[PDB]
Design an enzyme around this catalytic site. Structure first.
Site, short mmCIF file in Angstrom:
data_model
loop_
_atom_site.label_atom_id
_atom_site.label_comp_id
_atom_site.label_asym_id
_atom_site.label_seq_id
_atom_site.Cartn_x
_atom_site.Cartn_y
_atom_site.Cartn_z
CE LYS A 60 -3.22 -0.67 -0.59
NZ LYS A 60 -3.77 -1.39 -1.91
CB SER A 61 4.48 1.75 -0.01
OG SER A 61 4.42 1.03 1.45
CB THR A 64 3.45 -1.33 -5.18
OG1 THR A 64 3.47 -1.34 -3.96
CG2 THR A 64 4.38 -2.29 -5.73
CE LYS A 112 2.43 -5.74 -5.98
NZ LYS A 112 0.92 -5.48 -6.25
CG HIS A 117 3.86 -6.17 -1.36
ND1 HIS A 117 4.19 -4.71 -1.92
CD2 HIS A 117 2.71 -6.26 -1.81
CE1 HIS A 117 3.08 -4.53 -2.64
NE2 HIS A 117 2.24 -5.39 -2.83
CB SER A 172 -3.38 2.72 2.46
OG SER A 172 -3.57 2.07 0.89
N1 LIG Z 1 -1.10 7.60 -9.84
C1 LIG Z 1 -1.08 7.53 -8.24
N2 LIG Z 1 -0.95 8.71 -7.45
C2 LIG Z 1 -0.94 8.62 -6.08
N3 LIG Z 1 -1.39 7.52 -5.57
C3 LIG Z 1 -1.68 6.27 -6.08
C4 LIG Z 1 -1.47 6.45 -7.65
N4 LIG Z 1 -1.93 5.28 -7.98
C5 LIG Z 1 -2.07 4.42 -6.83
N5 LIG Z 1 -2.03 5.13 -5.69
C6 LIG Z 1 -2.11 4.70 -4.39
O1 LIG Z 1 -1.22 3.84 -3.76
C7 LIG Z 1 -1.94 3.11 -2.79
C8 LIG Z 1 -1.84 1.35 -3.13
O2 LIG Z 1 -0.25 1.06 -3.10
P1 LIG Z 1 -0.02 -0.24 -3.86
O3 LIG Z 1 0.02 -0.17 -5.30
O4 LIG Z 1 1.47 -0.49 -3.20
O5 LIG Z 1 -1.11 -1.18 -3.52
C9 LIG Z 1 -3.34 3.39 -2.74
O6 LIG Z 1 -3.36 4.50 -1.70
P2 LIG Z 1 -4.60 4.83 -0.92
O7 LIG Z 1 -5.19 3.71 -0.57
O8 LIG Z 1 -4.33 5.85 0.21
O9 LIG Z 1 -5.68 5.57 -1.93
C10 LIG Z 1 -3.52 3.99 -3.89
O10 LIG Z 1 -4.60 4.76 -4.25
#
Ligand SMILES: Nc1ncnc2c1ncn2[C@@H]1O[C@H](COP(=O)(O)O)[C@@H](OP(=O)(O)O)[C@H]1O
Ligand SMILES: Nc1ncnc2c1ncn2[C@@H]1O[C@H](COP(=O)(O)O)[C@@H](OP(=O)(O)O)[C@H]1O
Lengths: 293, 293
Positions: free
Chosen positions: A45-46, A48, A104, A106, A136
C-alpha cells in the site's frame, strides 16, 4: 477458490502471509533472476502500482501505446503472487516476460530470492509514512477477499502496530530495506515526495535507470501516472481482477491517492499511542517520514 | 572605504543595488558553479543566515566543531558581495572553498549566474512575510553602513512598497523564484514555518540534501540553530565585521527573530495602505504568507 478466500494468515519464516501466497514457497526461494531485472520493492500500500507504471513508461521511452500492451499484472508481475486455477502465478508470468523485466514484490529483505542480490539487480525501494499505510491497508483488506476480514478500524490498527498483518511489521520492513541500501544498488524513494514533486522524483528514477528522456516525455509520464488518470485506466486500477479476489464496491483499489488521509481515521488517543511506538521503533534510524505535505 | 560607505544605491539591470556590490558584475555573471554547489537564495532579511547554519550542520552530519571551522562569511559566502581592500570578495572566498559549497545570494532569478541552472544545482529558496521583512530591512539599514540611511520608518516603508530598496521589489523577487521551482530542483521554504515547526522544516532540507541523520542529530541541529543560541554565536551573529561595515550599536544583526514583530512598527494607516498594494501584487499567485504564528 473457497479454500483461499478470507482465510487466516499463515506464517512463513516468521512472517504472517496471505493464505493464497503461502504455498510452494520453495519456488519463490529458488526464483532465477536475470541481471537486468529491475525490482520494485515496497511494504504493501506504499505506491507500488504507481511506480510500476512510471518505470514501465521510462523503460518504454514514454510510449503510451506500449504501456497499453497488457494489464499491470502482466507487465509488472508480483513475484510472490499465486491464485492457482484463477490466475497465472507471478513467477510463471515472469518466466514468459521479455528482458528487462520489472518485478514487483512486497517481500522483506530476508525473504527476497537471493538471486536478486547475487545478480546485482537494480532495485527501487519505495516507502510511505506508516499512518497512511495503515489506513490504505485497512481499506484494502475490506475489498481484497484473499485477506482476512480486518474487523473494526480500532481492531485493525492494533494488529498493524504489532505487525500481525501480511508481510509483518512496517517498522522492520522499512528499517531492514534501508540498511541494504549501503551494499546494493537500491534507489530509496518516499511516496510523499512523489506526491509533492513527481517531476524531480521521476528524474531520480530516470538517472538511476541510466536513461535520458527530454522534458516533453517527462511531462507525459507525469500526466499518464497522475492519480486522476491512473484511477480511470483499466489496465492499472485493478478492476480486471475477478470479483472473488477484489470487490471494489467495498473499497476502490485507487482509493484517495493522497498524503494525510490517515487524519480522517486516527483518533487522538490512537495517534498518541501510535507516535509513542513509532519513536521507539524509528528514532535511531536515518529515516525521516512526512505524514502530510 | 569612504568611497562605498552610506552611498546611494546604483541600478544594475534595473535593480537598485548596494553601491559596494554594484561593481565588477561581469565577475558575477561569469561565475563557475559546480554540480554539487548548494544555493541558498532569499530576498534580504528573510532568514538567510539561519538557514545557512542549518545547511552547514546538515552537510557536516551535525558536527558542531566542524561548524566552528570559520566565520559564516567564509563558511557560506555571499556570491555578489564585494568589500575591496577590506574583505575577500564573496567570489574570491567561494573559489577557495571545498565542495560541496554552500552559496548564499539575494539575487533575483534573472541575475543569478547562468552556470547554476546549467549545472542543475540544488537551491533552497527561503521567503518571509513582506511586513516582517520590511521592518527587518529598515533596522538593518540603520546598522549597515554600506546601505543608504533609510530615513524615518515612514519614509522607509514607502521605498520598500515601491521597490526602491537594494535588490528591488519583494513582490517580484518572491514571485519569480516561486515560478522557477517548476523548472529547477528548488526547495521553497517559509520563515514562519521554520519558526513554528523547525523539526519538520529541517527534515525537508535533510531529505533534499540526501543526508542520513537520526533524531539525536536532528534535535541537535534544532538546538544549535535556535535564535537564542545563534545570537550569542560569535561565528554567525555578524559581530566579526568591521564597525565600518556593521555597527550593531544602532541595531543588532540578530535583532528579534520572530514572526509578527511588524505589528510594533506598522501604523494602522500604513497597514491598510500596505494590504491594498499587497492584494494588487499577490492575489493571483498561489503563495500563502502568514504575518504571525
Ligand atoms: N497515480 C497515483 N498517485 C498517487 N497515489 C496512487 C497512484 N496510484 C495508486 N496510488 C495509491 O497507492 C496505494 C496503493 O499502493 P500499492 O500499489 O502499493 O497497493 C493506494 O493508496 P490509498 O489507499 O491511500 O488511496 C492507491 O490509491
Ligand atoms: N536562528 C534564528 N532563528 C530565527 N530567526 C533568525 C535566526 N537567525 C537570524 N534570524 C533572523 O533573520 C533575519 C536576518 O535575515 P538575513 O540573515 O536574511 O539577513 C533577522 O530578522 P529580524 O530583524 O526580524 O530579527 C534575524 O534576527
Amino acid at each position: 477458490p473457497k479454500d483461499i478466500l478470507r482465510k487466516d494468515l499463515k506464517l512463513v519464516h516468521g512472517y504472517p502471509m496471505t493464505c493464497a501466497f503461502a504455498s510452494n514457497w520453495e519456488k519463490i526461494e529458488q526464483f532465477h533472476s536475470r541481471p537486468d531485472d529491475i525490482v520494485i520493492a515496497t511494504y504493501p500500500k506504499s505506491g507500488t502500482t504507481w511506480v510500476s507504471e512510471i518505470i514501465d513508461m521510462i523503460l518504454n521511452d514514454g510510449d503510451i501505446e506500449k504501456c497499453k500492451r497488457g494489464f499491470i499484472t502482466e507487465k509488472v508481475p508480483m513475484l510472490e503472487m499465486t491464485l492457482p486455477g484463477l490466475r497465472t502465478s507471478g513467477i510463471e508470468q515472469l518466466e514468459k516476460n521479455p528482458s528487462p523485466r520489472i518485478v514487483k514484490t512486497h517481500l522483506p529483505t530476508d525473504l527476497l530470492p537471493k538471486s536478486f542480490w547475487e545478480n546485482n539487480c537494480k532495485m527501487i525501494y519505495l516507502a510511505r509514512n506508516a499512518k497512511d499505510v495503515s489506513v490504505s491497508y485497512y481499506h484494502f483488506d475490506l475489498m481484497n477477499n484473499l485477506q482476512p476480514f480486518p474487523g473494526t478500524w480500532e481492531e485493525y490498527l492494533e494488529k498493524f502496530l504489532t505487525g500481525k498483518v501480511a508481510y509483518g511489521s512496517w517498522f522492520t520492513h522499512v528499517k531492514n530495506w534501508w540498511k541494504r541500501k549501503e551494499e546494493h544498488p537500491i534507489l530509496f524513494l518516499y511516496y510523499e515526495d512523489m506526491k509533492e514533486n513527481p517531476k524531480e522524483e521521476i528524474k531520480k528514477i530516470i538517472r538511476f535507470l541510466e536513461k535520458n528522456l527530454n522534458d516533453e516525455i517527462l511531462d507525459r509520464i507525469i500526466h499518464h501516472t497522475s492519480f486522476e488518470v491512473m484511477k480511470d485506466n483499466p489496465l492499472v486500477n485493478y478492476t480486471h481482477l475477478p470479483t472473488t479476489v477484489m470487490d471494489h464496491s467495498k473499497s476502490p483499489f485507487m482509493r484517495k491517492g493522497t498524503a494525510g488521509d490517515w487524519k480522517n481515521y486516527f483518533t487522538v488517543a490512537q495517534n498518541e499511542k501510535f507516535d509513542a511506538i513509532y519513536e521507539t521503533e524509528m528514532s535511531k534510524t536515518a529515516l525521516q517520514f512526512r505524514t502530510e505535505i
